[PDB]
Design a protein around this ligand. Structure first.
Ligand SMILES: COc1ccc(-c2cc(C(=O)Nc3cc(-c4c(-c5ccc(F)cc5)noc4C(C)C)ccn3)n3c2CN2C[C@H](O)[C@H](O)[C@H]2C3)cc1
Length: 285
């Protein structure tokens, strides 16, 4: 079974809505292939990927097209997601690994923002480690929910609006996203703050809530998230994680985040440990 007369389809390797391992027959290396039934967001997403190409940690798209009952996108092969690796590490990351990940993840989000888009679904499942020579590089994937937030030429910001439906993953959504406020740059970074504390804790305190329908469940998540102060969420971990989250929640809708300040919070903590720290992630030790 071939895709584009040139890619051999292999076994399924995930879903993000089905991801297959593939082989570039001509070049002889493996690839990742995403197939979508013609119902649609793959072609729109491919254009965003191609707008982002060249950035550090942005995957390369090898081919786009249609094959029978599927729209197809072929991407360079990447490794397991950070969720996969978190589970492999028994849902415990060392502080070193969390700080190493935080530095790269802030930079990936900054790059997307520099290209005039907001990601709007920041979660561990959308960060993948490279393979082989790129095993120390964090990649970001999935622009199916991404949105342009400013004009490319003038940088004029999209307007503030409310009554927006939740586009993303409830567990990691910002408070203002739960309130139905238009997402902006601050919300990508606030979601990352929850991801980092997720890595620190093994789970977040608004996980595991049940309800009749999705809407009621999101309301339960919203209530618990709003009633858990950052100081309680982050107790027992270096204060930098609370400082990060408080900074993100204090950003105005239109504010350009101080990415450098946020990276330096964690970089200073990392460097203060001196030689007691490596540049080796837990799963490579
Ligand atoms: C021999 O050594 C090896 C070999 C392979 C691996 C290897 C490679 C992968 C993998 O998923 N790669 C991958 C996935 C995507 C991808 C896409 C996507 C694909 C194409 C496209 F155009 C746009 C998006 N959308 O979503 C995903 C993720 C979330 C699934 C993109 C690029 N790369 N996984 C493994 C290892 N596995 C362990 C566990 O079982 C995981 O589930 C599975 C994941 C590790 C070691």
């Amino acid at each position: 079974l071939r895709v584009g007369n040139r890619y051999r389809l292999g076994r399924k390797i995930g879903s993000g809505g089905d991801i297959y391992l593939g082989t570039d027959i001509a070049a002889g290396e493996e690839v990742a292939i995403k197939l979508e039934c013609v119902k649609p967001q793959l072609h729109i997403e491919s254009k965003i990927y191609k707008m982002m190409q060249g950035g550090v940690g942005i995957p390369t798209i090898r081919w786009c097209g249609a094959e029978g009952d599927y729209n197809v996108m072929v991407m360079e092969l990447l490794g397991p997601s950070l969720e996969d690796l978190f589970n492999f590490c028994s849902r415990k990351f060392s502080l070193k690994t969390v700080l190493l990940l935080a530095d790269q993840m802030i930079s990936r989000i900054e790059y997307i923002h520099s290209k005039n888009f907001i990601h709007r679904d920041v979660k561990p499942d959308n960060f993948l480690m490279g393979l082989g020579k790129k095993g120390n590089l964090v990649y970001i994937i999935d622009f199916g929910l991404a949105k342009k937030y400013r004009d490319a030429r003038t940088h004029q910001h999209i307007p503030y609006r409310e009554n927006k439906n939740l586009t993303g993953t409830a567990r990691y959504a910002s408070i203002n996203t739960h309130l139905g406020i238009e997402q902006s740059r601050r919300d990508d970074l606030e979601s990352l703050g929850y991801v980092l504390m997720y890595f620190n804790l093994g789970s977040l305190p608004w996980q595991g809530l049940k309800a009749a329908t999705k809407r009621q469940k999101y309301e339960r998540i919203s209530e618990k998230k709003m009633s858990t102060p950052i100081e309680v969420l982050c107790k027992g971990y270096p204060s930098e994680f609370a400082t990060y989250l408080n900074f993100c929640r204090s950003l105005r809708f239109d504010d350009k985040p101080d990415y450098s300040y946020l990276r330096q919070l964690f970089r200073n903590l990392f460097h203060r440990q001196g030689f007691s720290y490596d540049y080796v992630f837990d799963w490579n030790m």
